[PDB]
Amino acid sequence: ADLEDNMETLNDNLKVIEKADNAAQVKDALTKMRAAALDAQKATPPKLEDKSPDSPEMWHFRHGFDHLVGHIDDALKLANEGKVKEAQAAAEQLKCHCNACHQHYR
Amino acid sequence: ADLEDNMETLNDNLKVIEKADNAAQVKDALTKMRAAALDAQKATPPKLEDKSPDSPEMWHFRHGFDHLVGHIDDALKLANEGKVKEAQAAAEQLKCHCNACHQHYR
Ligand code: HEC
Ligand code: HEC
Ligand code: NI
């Protein structure tokens, strides 16, 4: 899917995690976030269209998703050990990373 | 140093990074910040003084500094590599993580 679709998937599953009742629910939402981040990592954002595909700004954009995926993996590790509160807390650590990419590339 | 002093160091050295013009200064301030964060991690904050150190909240508090330290290291790598503007921008994005912890425990 394209970038706005994947961002909607990111945003909607954050709320699913916030309201989750067990760690397996958090797990399911996080795996869907993980796939959406990796799919978005293949897009070219508008504010970098007129830029070389190999530009350092393109690689910083792509590495922003690598960082986010690492944090999603960190939260998945807690969710798969049944720690619903702790994986929920880890998922809200994502929000600042969301905003840091937006500040430069949205 | 006590918790409040370490916060003073983090707050004042963020502004030092803002006004610096060369990597040597950025490195110096990021280094003071990194030690202050690791020192603050060992404290018990007043809004948690009647919890136990193994309480979730006390572990969430600790984990916030682990995460902040890693992002300081990322900015130190940029200033060791001599990219002053990028390191200054990485340091500005620390504020979101400051605020996230503050909204819970400040
Ligand atoms: C870069 C590394 C990003 C990260 C990490 C996240 N997002 Fe993002 N987001 C990014 C761009 C470039 C854009 C604009 C894309 C465009 O073509 O307009 C966005 C946009 C959003 C939006 C608005 C959706 C829309 O239809 O325009 C939302 C709601 C959004 N992003 C949410 C979001 C969340 C919750 C993130 C982390 C969990 C996140 N984004 C990360 C780039 C990047
Ligand atoms: C938790 C993981 C925190 C992180 C990360 C940061 N801060 Fe912090 N801050 C925290 C607490 C619990 C408190 C209250 C301490 C107390 O004893 O009252 C604070 C306080 C501050 C203050 C005000 C200090 C004072 O005047 O008493 C400042 C200016 C401040 N913090 C700055 C700051 C900055 C710039 C941070 C990121 C670089 C940062 N803090 C991170 C908890 C946490
Ligand atoms: Ni991070």
Side-chain angles (χ1 to χ4, degrees), chain A residues 1-17 19-41 43-46 48-49 51-84 86-106, chain B residues 1-14 16-20 22-56 58-84 86-106:
Chain A
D2 55 58
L3 196 42
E4 319 98 278
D5 297 323
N6 287 318
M7 289 304 150
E8 273 297 273
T9 303
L10 290 174
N11 192 278
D12 277 283
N13 278 285
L14 254 194
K15 301 173 184 130
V16 171
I17 296 171
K19 331 249 195 298
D21 293 331
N22 62 57
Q25 284 167 18
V26 178
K27 198 280 305 166
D28 291 341
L30 286 168
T31 66
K32 300 203 217 171
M33 297 186 72
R34 205 198 188 263
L38 290 175
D39 199 33
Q41 190 181 44
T44 294
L48 281 188
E49 281 267 316
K51 193 64 70 191
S52 166
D54 203 44
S55 67
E57 285 83 19
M58 270 293 148
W59 285 108
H60 191 249
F61 174 77
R62 296 167 73 152
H63 292 154
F65 291 109
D66 286 321
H67 191 129
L68 191 80
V69 165
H71 280 334
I72 292 167
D73 286 345
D74 289 341
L76 280 166
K77 303 333 143 185
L78 299 164
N80 278 329
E81 307 162 68
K83 311 189 159 81
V84 55
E86 304 87 313
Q88 272 172 316
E92 270 230 341
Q93 193 164 268
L94 296 165
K95 304 184 50 134
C96 279
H97 306 266
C98 308
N99 272 253
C101 185
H102 294 164
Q103 179 190 332
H104 295 334
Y105 301 104
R106 179 184 187 176
Chain B
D2 55 52
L3 189 47
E4 271 168 302
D5 193 73
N6 283 319
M7 292 305 140
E8 291 308 303
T9 305
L10 288 158
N11 189 58
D12 296 348
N13 278 280
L14 219 39
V16 170
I17 292 170
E18 214 181 44
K19 302 161 202 175
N22 65 71
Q25 313 169 286
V26 172
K27 186 140 125 198
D28 189 88
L30 285 172
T31 305
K32 295 194 170 64
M33 291 185 69
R34 197 195 187 275
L38 286 162
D39 204 59
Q41 173 173 70
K42 305 173 155 179
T44 303
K47 282 179 93 170
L48 299 183
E49 43 186 309
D50 294 307
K51 305 271 292 133
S52 148
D54 312 48
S55 50
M58 274 300 294
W59 279 122
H60 185 225
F61 175 80
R62 289 192 193 83
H63 293 143
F65 292 113
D66 281 323
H67 185 245
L68 186 81
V69 164
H71 281 239
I72 288 163
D73 283 341
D74 287 327
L76 272 168
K77 190 189 175 175
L78 296 184
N80 280 318
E81 286 177 341
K83 310 124 189 205
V84 172
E86 292 191 21
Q88 287 183 311
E92 183 90 52
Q93 293 177 327
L94 294 170
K95 294 154 112 69
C96 188
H97 304 283
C98 313
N99 294 335
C101 181
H102 290 167
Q103 294 320 303
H104 290 280
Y105 311 125
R106 179 178 171 175

